[PDB]
C-alpha cells in the first residue's frame, strides 16, 4: 500500500546517499528534470559488449549522454522496447549517446551469461550490457519494473526516468536535447521513431501470470498452491484472467514443472498475443479455439509464442507440456 | 519487482472470482472501459452518512452511476482529492450519481469511527462512508493506492479505474457520460471542475516519509532503526529527501514516539508544503509553536512560496507520536 500523485515515480527499495534525489524526477516526463548524480552501477557480476568484457564506470562517460536501460531477455515488454533503444544507439552513438543495457534477471536462468548473450543477439543489441545478477544496481537505482530507463546528461545528472513500456518519442525527444546540450550545434539524423514502429499494446492485458509459488497472483483452480509435487484438476469454472492446472505438477519458486504425461494448463486471458516462458526439453501442445499447435522446446529457457491473435479479446487457452518442462509464466501482447 | 506497460493498472492483492476482470481496465483511461461487475463491498466494519449508519449494498445502487472513492482522512493526497469528489457529489447526486467513500485506514488511529467522522466533517463529506478497517474491500477491489477511484455504471459494471491523485476532468467527463447512459437526455450543470481548482502538486515531491519501523524508507541517520527506545543524533551529513532523529525516541510500527525533552527530527525535503501526521497531546515546535491535541491528523508545518529543496526541524514534546511527513 501507499499514496501517490499520478505520474509519480514509485521507487523500489530505500534511499541512500547516491540515489536520494531520484524522487525529484517524475515518471517519464516530457521536459528535462534534475534528479541528482546517477548512482553507481553497483555489484555488476559481468559485462558484455565491452572490450575484454571489462566494466564501464559511469564517470568515464561524462561528456556523453548516458541511457540506462533495465531489461531482462525473456521479458516480452523489454523485447518490444529494446528495438527502440537499439534504434537510438544506432542513430546517436556517434553523436554522443552511450547506452548501457543493465540486465537484471527476472528468473534464475537469466543469470547465465551465455543465455543473456543469445538473447541480446536475437534482439540486435550491440551496446554494453551489465549483468546485474544480484540486483545491486537495480536496488541502487531504486528501480521497480522492467522495462525502466534513466537518462543521464553529459554532467552525469539524471534528467529523465521512465518506468514501464511505452512513450518512446518522449524519451527520444529528450535524448536529442541532451545530445545538443552536450555538443551544441550537433547534427542528428531524423528521429529513430521514424522507422521504428510503436508496438506497445493497450495497457489492459492479463497481468503477468507467474507460476512461481511466491509470485502467483491468478491461479484460479482453488485448493492450495504450495511448493512440492501434487495432482491438480480444473475447477468447475475458471475465473477470467486466470489459470488452472490439470495432471501432476511440481511447483517451486521459479515456476511450475510438468511432472506427468497428462499435465495441462488452462488459461483465461485478455490479450492479443500470448507467450509462455518455459525451459527444459520436450514438447508443448497448445489448443486454442479447437486449433492445436505443437512446439518443440529446448535450449535456453525463454519466451515461446503460443497465440498470435487478431485483436485484443478475452479467450481461453490450453497448454500441455511434456514431463520435465518448467513453466515460469504466461506473458502477453 | 514486476513488469509494466505504461498506464496499466498496478492492482494489489490477488485475483478472485469477483474481481478477475478489473485488469481489463487501464489506469485512468479517458475513454470508457469495460472491466466486469463491481466487486462486493465486503468486510465493511461500519458506515457513516447513511440512514442509521446502515450498510449500502452495491446491487441496490443499480440504476445509478456509482463512484467508489478510496481514502484515509489523514492522507494529504486524499484531502486534496476529496473536494473534487464532494463537488461531483453535490453536482450530480440528483442526476443519478451515488458516491461511496471507502475509508481504508492507513494507520491504526484511522480505525476509530469517531476520528473518521471528524475528518469527514472537516472535508465536507456528506456522502456514504464505508469503513474498511480490515482492508477487505481494498483487497476485493485489488486496490494499491490512496487515493483510488472505481467508476461503476448503472448496470453495475466498472468502466473506469483511477489510481493516484489527479486528472479530475478525465474522470468527471466519464461520470457525465455514464449519467447520460443511465438516463438519456439528462440535463447536467457545467463541470464541477469549473469552480473546483486542480491543486495537484508536481509528482516529484519527497516520497511519503514513514516513521513506523515496517514502512521506513528514507531514514538517513545510519545505525539501527528497529523497534524499541534508544538515543539518537543527527548523522554527520543528512541525505536529501531524508530525515534524522535526535534525543530519545520509542520506535514502533505505527511511528516514532517522542520521549525525552530534547527529541528532534531533521528533514531534508523537496516540496512546497510539508505536513506532519502526529498523535498524542502536547506541543510541537518547528524551526514557531503548534499545540497538538485530539484525533491524530495532519498538521501543516511548512507552507512554502514554491517547490523547494529545503530543511526543517521539529521538536515534539514528550508523548507525541509522529507517524509521517507528507508533502504538497
For residue B189, the 8-state DSSP code is: P
Question: How far apart are the C-alpha atoms of B58 and B79, rounded to whole Å?
Answer: 25
Let me know: does B238 contact B220? Beta carbons within 8 Å. yes
CB A200 within 8 A of CB B5: yes
Residues of B in contact with A8 (CB under 8 A): 164, 203-205
Measure the CA–CA gap between A71 and A131, rounded to whole angstroms: 10
B235 interface with A at CB cutoff 8 Å = no
Shortest distance, CA A204 to any CA of chain B (angstroms)? 5
Q: Which residues of B are less than 8 Å from A201 in CB distance?
A: 5
3-state SS class at B88: helix
Contact between residue A30 and residue B102 where contact means Cβ atoms under 8 Å apart: no
Between chains, do A4 and B200 touch, taking CB under 8 Å as contact? no
Pairing of strands A148-152, A145-146: unpaired
Residue B194: burial class (beta carbons within 10 Å; 0-12, 13-18, 19+): exposed
Interface membership of B31 toward A (CB under 8 Å)? no
Question: Rounded to the nearest 5 degrees, what angle is found at the Cα of B119, between the Cα atoms of B115 and B123?
Answer: 170
Three-state SS for chain A is CEECECCCCCCCCCCCCCCCCHHHCCECCCCCCCCCECCCCCCCCEEECCHHHCCCCHHHHCCCEEEEEEECCCCHHHHHHHHHHHHHHHHHHHHCEEEEEEECCCCHHHHCHHHHHHHHHHCCCCCCEEECCCCHHHHHCCCCEECEEEEECCCCEEEEEEECECCHHHHHHHHHHHHHHHCCCCCCCCCHHHCCCCCCCCCCCCCCEECCCCCCCCECCCCCCCCEEEEECCCCCCCCCEEEEEEEEEECCCCEEECCCCCEEEEEEEEEEEEEEEECCEEEEEEECCEEEEEEECCCCEEEEEEEEEEEEEEEEEEEECCCCEEEEEEEC
Whether A146 and B77 lie within 8 Å, measured CB to CB: no
The total number of residues written for chain B in this structure: 328
> Which DSSP category does B127 fall into?
S
Q: Measuring CA to CA, which residue among B227, B230, B219, B224 is closest to residue B253?
A: B227
Instruction: Name the pairing type of β-strands B148-152 and B158-163.
Output: antiparallel
- Neighbouring CB atoms inside 10 A of A324's CB total 14
Q: How far apart are CA A254 and CA A241, in angstroms?
A: 21
Neighboring chain A residues of B207 at a CB cutoff of 8 Å: 11, 15, 23
Instruction: Tell me the C-alpha distance between B227 and B159, whole Å.
Output: 44
CA distance linking residue B20 with residue B151, whole number of Å = 16
Contacts of B28 in chain A (CB under 8 A): 6
The answer to whether A179 and A95 have CB atoms below 8 angstroms apart is yes
Within an 8 Å CB–CB cutoff, is residue A6 touching chain B? yes
The Cβ of residue A189 has, within 10 Å, a number of other Cβ atoms equal to: 12
* Burial group, residue B224, by CB count within 10 angstroms (0-12, 13-18, 19+): exposed
**The CATH number of domain B202-327, selected from 3.40.718.10, 2.60.120.260, 3.50.50.60, 3.40.120.10:** 2.60.120.260
Q: At what angle do helices B113-123 and B76-92 cross, to 10 degrees?
A: 70
Closest of A116, A112, A111, A130 to residue A57, by C-alpha: A130
- Chain B residue with CA closest to A144: the answer is B1
Yes or no: say if B61 and B97 are a contact pair by the CB < 8 Å rule: no
Whether the Cβ atoms of residue B127 and residue B89 lie closer than 8 Å to each other: yes
Residues 6+ apart with CB under 8 A from A180: A186, A188
Residues B249, B258: contact at Cβ < 8 Å?
A: yes
Helix (H, G, I), strand (E, B) or coil at B201: coil
Q: Which residues contact B270 (CB under 8 A, 6 or more apart)?
A: A21, A23, A24, B204, B205, B206, B240, B241, B307, B308, B309
State how far residue A143 is from chain B, nearest Cα, in angstroms.
Answer: 8
CATH, domain A1-201, list 3.30.70.360, 3.40.30.10, 3.40.50.1970, 3.40.630.30: 3.40.30.10
The residue among A5, A141, A169, A218 with the most chain B CBs within 10 A of its CB, best to mutate, is: A5
**What is the rounded CA–CA span in Å between residue A18 and residue A35?**
11
Q: At what angle do helices A168-182 and A76-92 cross, to 10 degrees?
A: 30
3-state helix, strand, coil in chain B (%, to 5): 20, 35, 45
Backbone angles phi, psi at A110, to 5 degrees: -85, -5
User: What SS3 class is residue B199?
Assistant: coil
Helix B76-92 and helix B168-182: axis angle, to 10°? 30
Q: Distance between terminal CA atoms of chain A? A: 27
Q: Where are the domains of chain A?
A: 1-201, 202-332
Question: What residues in A contact B11, CB-CB < 8 Å?
Answer: 207
A204, HSE (Cβ side, Cα atoms, 13 Å): 24
* CB burial string A268-293: b at 16+ within 10 A, e below: bbbbbbbbbbbbbebebebbbeeeee
Give, in order, the Cα–Cα distances in Å from B247 to each of B83, B138, B239, B242.
39, 38, 19, 18
Kindly provide the resolution of this structure in angstroms, with one decimal.
2.2
> Are A287 and A317 spatial neighbours (Cβ–Cβ below 8 Å)?
yes
d(CA A328, CA A14): 28
Cα–Cα separations (whole angstroms), residue B128 to A2, B76, B120, B140, B153: 23, 20, 10, 19, 18
Pairing outcome for strands A97-103 and A129-131: parallel
**DSSP SS3 for B129:** strand
Looking at CATH, the fold of the domain delimited by A202-332 is given as Jelly Rolls (2.60.120)
- Asked whether B82 and B123 are in contact (CB, 8 A), the reply is yes
* Cell numbers describing residue B229: 527506545
Cβ neighbours of residue A8 closer than 8 Å, sequence gap 6 or more: A26, A27, B164, B203, B204, B205
What is the C-alpha separation between B212 and A318, in angstroms, rounded?
Answer: 46
* CB distance A36 to A161 below 8 Å: no
Reading the block at residue B215, the C-alpha cell is 514502512
What count of CB pairs under 8 Å joins A to B?
Answer: 190
Rounded distance, CA A17 to CA B238, Å?
A: 8
Residues of B in contact with A24 (CB under 8 A): 204, 240-241, 270, 309
Q: How many residues does chain A have?
A: 333
Give the integer Cα–Cα distance in Å for B149 and B78: 11
Residue B270: closest CA among chain A residues belongs to which residue? A24
- Among B76, B138, B204, select the one facing A26 at the smallest CB separation: B204
CA–CA separation, A243 and A221 (whole Å): 7
| Distance (Å, whole) CA B55 – CA B69 | 16
* DSSP-derived pairing of the beta strands A129-131 and A46-48: antiparallel
Pair A310, A272: CB distance under 8 Å? yes
Structure-determination technique: X-ray
Tell me whether B298 touches chain A (CB under 8 Å). Answer: no
Sign of the four-CA dihedral B243, B246, B252, B258: negative
Give the residue among A157, A110, A114 at the shortest CA–CA distance from A301.
A110
Write the CA distances from A190 to A171, A180, B283, integer angstroms: 15, 14, 62
Contact A165/B28, CB-based, under 8 Å? Answer: no
| Biggest CA pair distance of chain B | 67
CB contact A239 to B (< 8 Å): yes
Determine the Cα–Cα distance for residues A201 and A166; give it in Å rounded to an integer.
9
C-alpha cell at B29: 483511461
- Cβ distance B215 to B185 under 8 Å? no
B36 touches chain A (CB under 8 A): yes
With H, G, I as helix, E, B as strand and everything else as coil, classify residue B84. Answer: helix
A39 touches chain B (CB under 8 A): no
CA atoms within 13 A of residue A303's CA, in its CB half-sphere? 24
B23, B206, B309 ranked by CB distance to A241: nearest: B23
d(Cα A133, Cα A114) in Å, to the nearest integer? 13
Burial class (CB in 10 A: 0-12, 13-18, 19+), B59: exposed
Distance between CA B268 and CA B266 in Å, rounded? 7
Helices (H), chain B: 76-92, 113-123, 136-140, 168-182
Contacts of residue A320, defined as CB under 8 A and 6 or more positions apart, other chains included, come to A263, A264, A265, A284, A285, A286, A287
CB < 8 Å from A in window 105-134 of B: 106
A1, B12 in Cβ contact below 8 A? yes
User: Helices (H) and strands (E) in chain B — how many of each?
Assistant: 4, 17
| Cβ contacts of A188-195, under 8 Å, gap ≥ 24 | A188/A91, A188/A92, A188/A95, A189/A91, A191/A91, A192/A84, A192/A87, A192/A88, A192/A90, A192/A91, A193/A84, A193/A87, A193/A168, A193/A169, A195/A87
Contact A5, B205 (CB under 8 A): yes
A326 close contact with B: CB closer than 8 A = no
CA distance B227 to B259: 14
Strands A282-288 and A264-279, by their bridges, are unpaired
What's the grid cell of residue B203?
509528482
Phi, psi of A285 (to 5 degrees): -105, 125
Phi, psi of B66 (to 5 degrees): -130, 120
Residue B323 near chain A (CB below 8 Å): no
Whole-angstrom Cα distance, residue B291 to residue B293? 7
For residue A94, which phi and psi values (nearest 5 degrees)? -90, 5
B239 contact residues in A (CB cutoff 8 A): 15-17, 20
Nearest to B243 by CA among B161, B148, B325, B168: B325
Cα separation, A191 vs A167, whole angstroms:
14
DSSP B37-78: BPPP--S--EEESSGGG----GGGGTTSEEEEEEE-TT-HHH
Measured between alpha carbons, how far is A12 from B218 in angstroms, rounded to an integer?
12
Q: Which residues, including other chains, have CB under 8 Å from residue A172's CB and lie 6 or more apart?
A: A84, A88, A191, A192, A193
Within 10 A of A167 (CB to CB), how many other CB atoms are there? 19
Q: Which chain A positions have a beta carbon within 8 Å of B133's beta carbon? A: none
Tell me how crowded residue B42 is: count the other CB atoms within 10 A of its CB: 13
Amino acid at each position: 500500500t501507499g499514496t501517490e500523485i499520478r505520474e509519480q515515480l514509485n521507487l523500489g527499495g530505500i534511499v541512500n546517499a547516491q540515489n536520494a534525489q531520484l524522487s525529484n524526477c517524475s515518471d517519464g516526463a516530457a521536459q528535462l528534470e534534475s534528479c541528482g548524480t546517477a548512482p553507481d552501477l553497483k555489484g555488476i557480476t559481468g559485462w558484455l559488449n565491452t572490450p575484454g568484457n571489462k566494466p564501464i564506470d559511469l564517470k568515464s562517460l561524462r561528456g556523453k549522454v548516458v541511457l540506462i536501460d533495465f531489461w531482462a531477455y525473456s521479458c516480452i515488454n523489454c523485447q518490444r522496447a529494446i528495438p527502440h533503444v537499439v534504434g537510438w544507439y544506432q542513430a546517436y552513438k556517434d553523436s554522443g549517446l552511450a547506452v548501457i543495457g543493465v540486465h537484471t534477471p527476472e528468473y534464475a536462468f537469466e543469470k547465465v551469461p551465455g543465455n543473456v548473450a543469445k538473447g541480446a543477439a536475437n534482439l540486435g543489441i550491440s551496446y554494453p550490457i551489465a549483468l546485474d545478477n544480484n540486483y545491486a544496481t537495480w536496488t541502487n537505482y531504486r528501480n521497480r519494473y522492467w522495462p525502466a530507463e534513466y537518462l543521464i546528461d553529459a554532467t552525469g545528472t539524471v534528467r529523465h526516468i521512465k518506468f514501464g513500456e511505452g512513450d518512446y518519442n518522449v524519451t527520444e525527444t529528450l535524448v536529442r536535447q541532451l545530445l545538443n546540450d552536450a555538443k551544441p550545434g550537433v547534427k542528428l539524423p531524423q528521429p529513430s521513431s521514424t522507422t521504428t514502429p510503436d508496438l506497445t499494446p493497450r495497457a489492459a492485458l492479463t497481468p503477468e501470470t507467474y507460476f512461481g509459488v511466491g509470485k502467483v497472483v491468478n491461479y484460479g483452480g482453488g485448493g492450495a498452491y504450495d511448493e512440492g509435487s501434487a495432482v491438480f484438476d480444473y475447477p468447475p469454472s475458471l475465473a477470467a484472467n486466470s489459470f488452472a492446472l490439470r495432471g501432476r505438477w511440481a511447483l517451486d519458486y521459479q515456476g511450475a514443472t510438468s511432472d506427468g504425461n497428462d499435465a495441462a494448463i488452462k488459461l483465461n486471458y485478455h490479450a492479443k498475443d500470448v507467450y509462455i516462458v518455459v525451459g527444459g526439453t520436450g514438447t508443448l501442445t497448445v489448443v486454442r479455439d479447437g486449433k492445436p499447435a505443437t512446439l518443440p522446446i529446448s535450449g535456453p529457457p525463454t519466451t515461446h509464442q503460443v497465440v498470435a491473435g487478431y485483436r485484443l479479446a478475452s479467450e481461453t487457452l490450453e497448454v500441455r507440456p511434456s514431463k520435465g518442462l518448467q513453466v515460469f509464466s504466461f506473458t502477453y501482447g
